[PDB]
């Protein structure tokens, strides 16, 4: 029931987007962060600050423990949880319960943060990234298999200035214009090939390999647009020249009373036909974020992450079955009756290498 899945997300890019899920027998209601950048389903399993409730396994008659635990480290944060299996229902979209793996967190650090409204995480990336190993069936693999849905999901985030997670399909009401598809280069993260970044129509002076150092990924669980340091510095220099040192490093807010003074930022992606590319473009409203304002781009060590900053401009189709990611401008991506994103193409890729991925 894809229509019942519209508006099933609450929250925003800073505190993440989250889905209501019902777990165990009788069901316990939890609020679960949608993370296309990881592959484990995990919930709080004990009281903690910054959460109101947790999943108590002793109260579910269908819970079964797998008899082991797992630690998951991210760059910022980590958790250790017992691994078990239980029945889950997603009230908005499905008529039935499904058996899934579930990790219940008994220790964490810098994972549950102040201001968050979620108490668990739904990892929608591929088997490759599941811990302790790829044999721990992912939530979406369980769902596709047990709910008879196509191997596709899609996401509209509406909180620039909730949203929708469509499990099994694409909802036409959630985008305007055409959908453009870029190939998934490797099935772990949603890794896609970036060919070029432009700032106000000016291309940066960088080999396309730099944008894929060592991967460009689409990740709903990352707040900002994160760029490898060398790309970040080039971006910052272009955005500054076309317009507070602490502001670029996010260590400071910037205040007025603003947007007309800043350039559009374009990311070129290779089309499914390799001789063509398209571009997704964010306007200043997406990256000069009202909070006074914060800079919505930050440095990364080894990944270009198309986080919520950019996804809030787009309907994003994670088409696993056809190994491609789709993008279309989002109707909800407007601020004060003005679109804050664009998509266009085709452009020729004749002057770019046939593979920008190292």
């Amino acid at each position, epitope marked *: 029931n894809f229509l019942a899945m519209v508006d099933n997300l609450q929250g925003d890019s800073g505190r993440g987007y989250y889905l209501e899920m019902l777990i165990g027998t009788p069901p316990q209601k939890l609020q679960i962060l949608v993370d296309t950048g990881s592959s484990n389903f995990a919930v709080a399993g004990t009281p903690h600050s910054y959460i109101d409730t947790y999943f108590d396994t002793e109260r579910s008659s269908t819970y079964r423990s797998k008899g*082991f635990d797992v630690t998951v480290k991210y760059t910022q944060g980590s958790w250790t949880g017992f691994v078990g299996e239980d*029945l889950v229902t997603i009230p908005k979209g499905f008529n039935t319960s499904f058996l899934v*793996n579930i990790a219940t967190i008994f220790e964490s650090e810098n994972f549950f943060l102040p201001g968050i409204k979620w108490n668990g995480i739904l990892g929608l990336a591929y*088997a490759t990234l599941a811990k302790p190993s790829s*044999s721990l069936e*992912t939530f979406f693999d369980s769902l596709v*298999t*047990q709910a008879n849905i196509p191997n596709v999901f899609s996401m509209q985030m509406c909180g620039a200035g909730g949203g929708s997670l469509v499990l099994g399909g694409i909802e036409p009401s959630l985008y305007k214009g055409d959908i453009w598809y870029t190939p998934i280069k490797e099935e772990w993260y949603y890794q896609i090939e970036i060919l070029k970044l432009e700032i106000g129509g000016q291309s940066l002076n960088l080999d396309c390999r730099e944008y894929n150092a060592d991967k460009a990924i689409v990740d709903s669980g990352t707040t900002l647009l994160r760029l490898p340091q060398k790309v970040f510095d080039a971006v910052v220099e272009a955005v500054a020249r076309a317009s507070s040192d602490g502001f670029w490093t996010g260590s400071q807010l910037a205040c007025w009373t603003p947007w007309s003074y800043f350039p559009k930022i374009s990311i070129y992606l290779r089309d499914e036909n390799s001789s063509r590319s398209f571009r997704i473009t964010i306007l200043p409203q997406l990256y000069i974020q009202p909070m006074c304002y914060r800079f919505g781009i930050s440095p990364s060590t080894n990944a270009l992450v198309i986080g919520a900053t950019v996804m809030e401009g787009f309907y994003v189709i994670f088409d696993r079955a056809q190994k491609r990611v789709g993008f279309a401008a989002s109707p909800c991506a407007e601020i004060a009756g003005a679109a804050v994103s664009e998509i266009s193409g085709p452009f020729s890729t004749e002057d770019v290498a046939s593979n920008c991925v190292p």
Partner: nanobody
Amino acid sequence: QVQLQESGGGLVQPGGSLRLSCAASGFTFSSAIMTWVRQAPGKGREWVSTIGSDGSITTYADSVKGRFTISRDNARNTLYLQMNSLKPEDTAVYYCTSAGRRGPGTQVTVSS
């Protein structure tokens, strides 16, 4: 390498019965949720039954409830599907599946 290998299909009569097996290697089978899915000619994929790693939780599609029995022998790394009161519309390839992977399948043909 993870391997799954179904067997035991073939031709049966309406009202007949079969035991399917799925042999698993290359992963810790006794820790895996295991699923049977089938694909009938001219139809999309249809989930049949799921069984939790320890065998105690089993779920079934309404179309097979009360006719089919899923089970597993963890010590032999074997998943089973025992099917009673077979119907022509049970004609399908049956696959065992775990963690995105599936075996080559086994064909059940139910013919009048």
